[PDB]
Amino acid sequence: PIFLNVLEAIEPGVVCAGHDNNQPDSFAALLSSLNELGERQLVHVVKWAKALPGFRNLHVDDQMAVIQYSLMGLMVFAMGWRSFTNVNSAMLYFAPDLVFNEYRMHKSRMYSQCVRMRHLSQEFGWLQITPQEFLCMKALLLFSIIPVDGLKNQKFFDELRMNYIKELDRIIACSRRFYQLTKLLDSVQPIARELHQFTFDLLIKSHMVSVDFPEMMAEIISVQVPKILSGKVKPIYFHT
């Protein structure tokens, strides 16, 4: 199982947020750590992705775009998994030092999205997702959001997406497992979109609410995320 060997070998390990768990749960503190964790996770997603089978076949600009567009979704999906395997979905395991209980969910002002994310987390147990299915599905999410006008070398992208869908079937091998999981993959996107909207709005009014964004995440939020919110860059849904 060569493809899975590789997925297992490149999978990032533990990322802490650096959150001070002695300060009290305030909006500004929680979101400043979330923004920091976001940058720390981007670093790992980049190293991961550059080691993925075939990824370097993409034009370099398309590599960068696909990582930036799909970053939210990748982080949501991996977080749901962590929440499942670590805490059996009771709380949102963003990181070992940044675990969201109900109250934190409220204080972060992201409660509705939080509740969606633990539903997703539950799904992992409900459907009995295997580690190997999680990995292949996570790798697909990288190839699941693109400009409506296409990428710079769109054919290399389509090949790659096609080959990661096939790997997902080589792993499923039933028709019904494919239906459940394409459906699980689709449910990531609406959540990522709400997070995107929330993150964008928060950056615009960040000076007012004392929330702190790392530079690179600010650039990403200001240059790439509006492409998505303005409809130039859309998920590739399986269903509907």
């Binding site: 980049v46 370099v60 590599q63 960068m64 930036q68 530079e215 690179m216 650039e219 990403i220």
Partner: peptide, 8 residues
């Protein structure tokens, strides 16, 4: 800058 860091 994401670009600079990615391709550095």
């Amino acid at each position: 800058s994401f670009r600079d860091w990615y391709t550095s």
